[PDB]
From a paper:
Cytoplasmic dynein-1 is a conserved, minus-end-directed microtubule motor critical for cell division and long-range intracellular transport in eukaryotic cells. Cellular and structural studies have shown that dynein primarily exists in a pseudo-twofold symmetric, autoinhibited Phi state incompatible with movement along microtubules. [name] plays essential roles in the activation of dynein, including relieving autoinhibition and helping assemble the fully active DDA transport complexes.
To visualize the conformational landscape of dynein activation by [name], we incubated full-length human dynein with ATP and [name] at room temperature for 5 minutes. To fully understand dynein’s activation pathway, we began by analyzing particles corresponding to Open. We obtained six different Open subclasses, which we categorized based on the linker conformation (bent, intermediate, or straight) and the presence or absence of [name]. In monomeric dynein, [name] has been observed bound to both sitering and sitestalk, and to sitering in the absence of binding to sitestalk, but not to sitestalk only.
Residue numbers in the entry:
A (entry chain A): 1449 to 1597
B (entry chain A): 3511 to 3690
C (entry chain A): 2495 to 3152
D (entry chain E): 91 to 410
């Protein structure tokens, strides 16, 4: 029963390490022209999410993984949700920065495209509100706990 | 044992010259040993020979000699074969433990090592001409146990113990100079 | 005539200096000194018209025993006073200097002493790194000077009125060139010295230096890390050749050192001059015997002799009374550990042991060889507190007991002990015990590297730490790892072991910064930002813990780097001299002299015999029906006679390895 | 009586063990002495005559600790197998065993009050235990390395602990933690003492302290290093005033006499030396055995001392 005990201890350590990583994971902030806080380390966050997802998927194939099946399923669901949210948010930050750079240096762009300028201003206000909310709660779990995020 | 651990790199002529030198001088040292040594038949048996021949492996003196070298290794070997069927053999045999892969540009090094040796698996690397630096401490197979948690010095993360672990390495270029 | 000599051969070797002097004597009409067996350079032009040798100007000082091995003020010798005088002559005209010569000659120490003996010139010691920038000089000018405005223009002057601020350049040649064969910092220096000023970055306004000078010193450009200096810069700077001090200078300086050393024991004051003569002739014969052609680490400098003096004084300080036999035993031990430990060949080691025996018998008469010393000369502070010699048997027993303790403590791997591994362990221990002594263990793969060092680091209280490298390994991440290492060493006051292999030296992008770390402790341009602010607040918190008030930025940084250079220990491990693939190829002689080299070599025949006998003793292979051959082929000269079956088997295994 | 220092040579020698000794303890009820061995065994012998009585084995790993109760009706033990065995000296048999540790336990003993038992192991975790229930109720951590030795003071509201991270922390046993830090040592710490019985007057008079109403300013304890030196912390910030030098190897332990007037220490130099701290010099140096000494313990009421060695030999010195 020594091998079974070692496998159970390894699975418990896996769950504890995953929970500790989820609790200690935080969203880095970088100043952007004194307007908002763009997320820093997006590549590192994506790599960490991919590594956690791959580790969970590969660990859900062993013979002694049925002891913490519910915890493994919950961790996999949380990791998938966090990965999807980060994948959406990285594109959101990139597109918002592109739109802000496009519409910031141009003064007659509002006159040329008024509806597009108004839509961009509304999207920029929404992005600023989201950035303020993310800065208020920099924790990854706190950010993911916002309804409708 | 001297042949197994020493004459794994030399060609047939130098290998036999070394064996004859060892045998002649050990005879000069007055130690009892057989003269008509058949080391290949002595180190294996007919059932495993037929198993090897049924499997994808050639059949002559040097190839069966290196085959009996592969069976009872202690350090994980570096096979230099134009065919390259050791990966096929290891996926045929040790598929029961969900073998994983690691190379140079894998985005996870410490996380990959800790997860792999955490839930338990063997390892195998492809394109072995560019060597894998992950393989150094597990290649050593050193032990540092903390009371049920076996850990070795690679990465900031911690690992566990996996009983089933075989490493088979490959080299296509017959003229390379490995690091010392 | 004197200035023509010092201008046309002032950077030339001694034999070519003599050739130029005799050529000047041949073509000249000015009267010259009439002594034939002396060069003209050894004479001096005094205020009076007649010549007078420099030998009548040198003193013979006696320094305290408190400062006998680290003479921040140098011993005034002929070369010291001569180069002091010429530094004064070339410094009073604000021209920049460069002192060139082989490492170990004393250029930087004589430069410090001569440039600090006068109160007019203030000193700002600065070291040039490979990635140095003119922004470093701009920061130095901001700290030590100020921007004042006159109707003529902007003027940069020192804060201290009436003081000529001299900026120091410890390595004027070390900054790397660009892709177009120029060095930006030395072009900046040339611009200052040729225009009398520069242009400010913020205001784009011309400025004018008021009381600023420059002084540099470097190694020859034939060194691997040194570049041919630009002719446009070299047009200004005179060059002085600082050769090795030579036999008269060595005898004078180290006779003074021995006279100030041997004051602790009062009954051996008569042996100071024989000790000086013996050491100087051993040093010069070893230098003549061994050169750089066989191996590139065969450099011999008076830094070896100063380390010798420091070791002798460290051994003699705790001991109340010693005999002449014990004194020359400590002398022989230090000679071994400073000279023959770095040799590669067993023939060379035998030659050096015979050299030590010959030196002892020639220059130490009426002293018995056996009572003077033995063959196993081993010193350790483990078995006893005092630094007294320990014998092989009790040393091996104590190390075996400590190793049995170490098995279940950190690493559970069997080890076999013998003479060479005991010698290597004691050498490693003495290098860790000596502060700032950086160890460099090289040899064949295996052979106990990163195992004896780990064992000694565990037993001496040092915390071992290995280094790993990866792909996409940013200099920022390497600086973060060095941040944790430096914080542990200095801020937390925890000793660390800088264990690394040659496989971690795959990229030279971080090789230069560990070179500067080995040179002067700290590496410039590393930590800047909010992490810099947090580490200085951590440093001042550690200052409060250790009991000093340091709220000042640069003094806190200086205390941090002083703590680090106090408690940082370095051990290198790499293969013998066949690795020309890396950037160094031949590694820097300055790095070799700063470090200390231990040659592990391969396991000897007796080493293989013992490590085979210990491991094979578990099985039962004894044959009572064994027949002893009338002629046994034996390679181990200390085999038992008649050999047993186990002895024959392990001799066969040793022969198989051979 | 009060000046009955140990003197050479030993009046009795025992060689009935098969491994090195770890700890030496006694009993308050009867004149029976017990010890620990590295082969899961305990040796019991008499001092008046020098005859062994029985042995108390049963552990799975090497025993590295032993404790004695003030009432004399309780005992404690520890082993590297993460097990603590409590036995009764009346029947010389085991009573209960409590697990809970995760690494090799270095030392374990019961508190002076007897309500809770401290623990120490390579995992740097102190685990408490119950007597009637046998279940853990309290725990502590914070050490950066393996815990060497921990012992509460006379008051029982403070405990001195040292580790291998060159830092010894003194914390309140009752509720608080991290009262002061003593990191002046440069080597690893091995052992430390808490307080003697008649030590306050000695500290107030001989050392640099106030007279009469000193107010008991903190714990004044020596040792705490292995680089042939000792460090002493007085109060608050832990100023260093007294250093004990003379050990040829790493220190092993420190104790006091019955009257608290003599200082006796043991180390790995294979010699037991008693030095008078008032004279700041060694009073008598004696060779314990031919092997390294691991532990020693001097009897308080009886005028004798004991010593251990790794050569399976135990010597009992005579004090007069
Ligand atoms: N006249 C002298 N008096 C005292 N010490 C001397 C004298 N000449 C040489 N030395 C010693 O010889 C050594 C000279 O080494 P070296 O000049 O290379 O070192 P440095 O002055 O520290 O700097 P650098 O390596 O940059 O030259 C020093 O340790 C110095 O103490
Ligand atoms: N003196 C010795 N006696 C017995 N074994 C040794 C000795 N020195 C080294 N070894 C063995 O060599 C092994 C590997 O260490 P080594 O190869 O020397 O490190 P490195 O590869 O850094 O040189 C260790 O497991 C150790 O057991």
């Amino acid at each position: 029963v020594l091998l079974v005990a070692q496998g159970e201890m390894a699975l418990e350590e896996f769950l504890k390490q995953i929970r500790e990583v989820w609790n200690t994971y935080e969203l880095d902030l970088v100043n952007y022209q004194n307007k908002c806080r763009l997320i820093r380390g997006w590549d590192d966050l994506f790599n960490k999410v991919k590594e956690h997802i791959n580790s969970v998927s590969a660990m859900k194939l062993s013979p002694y993984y049925k002891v913490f099946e519910e915890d493994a399923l919950s961790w996999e669901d949380k990791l998938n949700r966090i990965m999807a949210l980060f994948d959406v948010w990285i594109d959101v930050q990139r597109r918002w920065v592109y739109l802000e750079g496009i519409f910031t240096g141009s003064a007659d762009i509002k006159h040329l495209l008024p509806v597009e300028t108004q839509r961009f201003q509304s999207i920029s206000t929404e992005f600023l509100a989201l950035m303020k909310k993310v800065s208020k709660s920099p924790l990854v779990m706190d950010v993911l706990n916002i309804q409708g995020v | 044992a001297a042949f197994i651990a020493y004459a794994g790199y030399f060609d047939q002529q130098m290998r036999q010259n070394l064996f004859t030198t060892w045998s002649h001088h050990l005879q000069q040292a007055n130690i009892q040993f057989r003269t008509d040594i058949a080391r290949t038949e002595y180190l294996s048996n007919a059932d495993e020979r037929l198993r090897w021949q049924a499997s994808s492996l050639p059949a002559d003196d040097l190839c069966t000699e290196n085959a009996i070298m592969l069976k009872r290794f202690n350090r994980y070997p570096l096979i230099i074969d134009p065919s390259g069927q050791a990966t096929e053999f290891i996926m045929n045999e040790y598929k029961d433990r969900k073998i994983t892969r690691t190379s140079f540009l894998d985005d996870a090094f410490r996380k990959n090592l800790e997860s792999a040796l955490r839930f338990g698996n063997p390892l195998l690397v492809q394109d072995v001409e560019s060597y894998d630096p992950v393989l150094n401490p597990v290649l050593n197979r050193e032990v540092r146990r903390t009371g049920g948690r076996v850990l070795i010095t690679l990465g900031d993360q911690d690992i566990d113990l996996s009983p089933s672990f075989v490493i088979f390495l490959s080299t296509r270029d017959p003229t390379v100079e490995f690091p010392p | 005539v004197y200035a023509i000599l010092w201008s046309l051969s002032g950077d030339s070797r001694l034999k070519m200096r003599a050739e130029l002097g005799e050529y000047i004597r041949r073509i000249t009409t000015v009267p010259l000194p009439t002594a034939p067996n002396i060069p003209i350079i050894d004479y001096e032009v005094s205020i009076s018209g007649e010549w007078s040798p420099w030998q009548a100007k040198v003193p013979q000082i006696e320094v305290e025993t408190h400062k006998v091995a680290a003479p921040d003020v140098v011993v005034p010798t002929l070369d010291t006073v001569r180069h002091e005088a010429l530094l004064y002559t070339w410094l009073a005209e604000h021209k920049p200097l460069v002192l060139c010569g082989p490492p170990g000659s004393g250029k930087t120490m004589t430069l410090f002493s001569a440039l600090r003996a006068l109160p007019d010139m203030e000193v700002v010691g600065l070291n040039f790194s490979s990635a140095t920038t003119p922004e470093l000089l701009l920061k130095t000018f901001d700290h030590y000077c100020e921007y004042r405005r006159t109707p003529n223009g902007v003027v940069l002057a020192p804060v201290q009125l009436g003081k000529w601020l001299v900026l120091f350049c410890d390595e004027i040649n070390l900054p790397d060139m660009d892709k177009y064969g120029t060095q930006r910092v030395i072009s900046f220096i040339r611009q200052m010295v040729e225009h009398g000023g520069f242009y400010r970055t913020s205001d784009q306004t011309w400025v004018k230096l008021e009381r600023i000078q420059f002084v540099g010193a470097c190694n020859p450009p034939t060194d691997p890390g040194r570049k041919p200096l630009s002719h446009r810069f070299l047009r200004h700077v005179p060059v002085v050749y600082v050769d090795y001090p030579g036999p008269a200078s060595l005898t004078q300086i180290y006779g003074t050192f021995n006279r100030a050393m041997l004051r602790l024991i009062p009954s051996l004051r008569t042996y100071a001059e024989p000790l000086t003569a013996a050491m100087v002739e051993f040093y010069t014969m070893s230098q003549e015997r061994f050169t750089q052609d066989t191996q590139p680490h065969y450099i011999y400098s008076p830094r070896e002799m100063t380390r010798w003096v420091r070791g002798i004084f460290e051994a003699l300080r705790p001991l109340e009374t010693l005999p002449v036999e014990g004194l020359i035993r400590i002398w022989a031990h230090e000679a071994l550990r400073l000279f023959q430990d770095r040799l590669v060949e067993d023939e060379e080691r035998r030659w050096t042991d015979e050299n030590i025996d010959t030196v002892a018998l020639k220059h130490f008469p009426n002293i018995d060889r056996e009572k003077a010393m033995s063959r196993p000369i081993l010193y350790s502070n483990w078995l006893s507190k005092d630094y007294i010699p320990v014998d092989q048997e009790e040393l091996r027993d104590y190390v075996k007991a400590r190793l049995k303790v170490f098995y279940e403590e950190e690493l559970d791997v069997p080890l076999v002990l013998f003479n060479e591994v005991l010698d290597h362990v004691l050498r490693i221990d003495r290098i860790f015990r000596q502060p700032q002594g950086h160890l460099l263990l090289i040899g064949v793969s295996g052979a106990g590297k990163t195992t004896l060092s780990r064992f000694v680091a565990w037993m001496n209280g040092l915390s071992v730490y290995q280094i790993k490298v990866h792909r996409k390994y940013t200099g920022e991440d390497f600086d973060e790892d060095l941040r944790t290492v430096l914080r542990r060493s200095g801020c937390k006051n925890e000793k660390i072991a800088f264990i690394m292999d040659e496989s971690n030296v795959l990229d030279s992008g971080f090789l230069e910064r560990m070179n500067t770390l080995l040179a002067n402790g700290e590496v410039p341009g590393l930590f800047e930002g909010d992490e810099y602010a947090t580490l200085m607040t951590q440093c001042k918190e550690g200052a409060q813990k250790e009991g000093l008030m340091l709220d000042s930025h640069e003094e806190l940084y200086k205390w941090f780097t002083s703590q680090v250079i106090r408690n940082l220990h370095v051990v290198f491990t790499m293969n013998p001299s066949s690795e020309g693939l890396k950037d160094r190829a031949a590694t820097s002689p300055a790095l070799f002299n700063r470090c200390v080299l231990n040659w592990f070599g391969d396991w000897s025949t007796e080493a293989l015999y013992q490590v085979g006998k210990e491991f094979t003793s578990k099985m039962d292979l004894e044959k009572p029906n064994y027949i002893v051959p009338d002629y046994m082929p034996v390679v181990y000269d200390k085999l038992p006679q008649p050999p047993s079956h186990r002895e024959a088997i392990v001799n066969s295994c040793v022969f198989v390895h051979q | 009586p009060k000046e009955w220092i140990p003197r050479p040579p030993e009046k009795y020698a025992l060689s009935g063990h098969r491994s090195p000794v770890t700890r030496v303890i006694f009993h308050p009820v009867f004149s029976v002495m017990v010890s620990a061995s590295e082969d899961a065994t305990i040796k019991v012998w008499d001092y008046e005559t020098g005859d062994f009585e029985r042995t108390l084995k049963g552990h799975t790993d090497s025993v590295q600790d032993i404790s004695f109760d003030h009432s004399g009706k309780l005992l404690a033990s520890c082993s590297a197998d993460m097990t603590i065995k409590l036995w009764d000296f009346q029947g010389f048999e085991c009573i209960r065993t409590m697990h809970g540790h995760d690494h090799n336990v270095s030392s374990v003993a019961i508190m002076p009050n007897g309500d809770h038992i401290v623990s120490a192991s390579r995992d740097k975790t102190i685990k408490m235990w119950e007597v009637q229930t046998g279940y853990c109720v309290k725990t502590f951590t914070g050490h950066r390395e393996w815990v060497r030795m921990v012992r509460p003071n006379q008051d029982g509201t403070l405990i001195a602990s040292c580790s291998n991270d060159q830092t010894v922390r003194v914390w309140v046993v009752a509720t608080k933690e991290c009262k002061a830090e003593l990191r002046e040592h440069e080597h690893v710490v091995e052992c430390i003492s808490w307080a003697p019985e008649s030590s306050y007057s000695s500290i107030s008079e001989a050392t640099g302290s106030e007279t009469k109403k000193s107010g008991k300013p903190g714990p004044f304890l020596l040792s705490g290093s292995r680089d042939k030196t000792i460090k002493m912390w007085d109060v608050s910030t832990g100023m260093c005033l007294m250093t004990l030098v003379g050990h040829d190897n790493w220190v092993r332990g420190v104790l006091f006499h019955s009257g608290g007037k003599f200082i006796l220490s043991c180390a790995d130099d294979k010699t037991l030396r008693v030095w008078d701290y008032k004279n700041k010099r060694c009073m008598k140096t004696l060779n314990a055995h031919e092997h390294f000494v691991t532990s020693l313990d001097f009897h308080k009421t009886a005028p004798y001392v004991v010593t251990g060695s790794v050569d399976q030999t135990v010597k009992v010195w005579e004090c007069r």
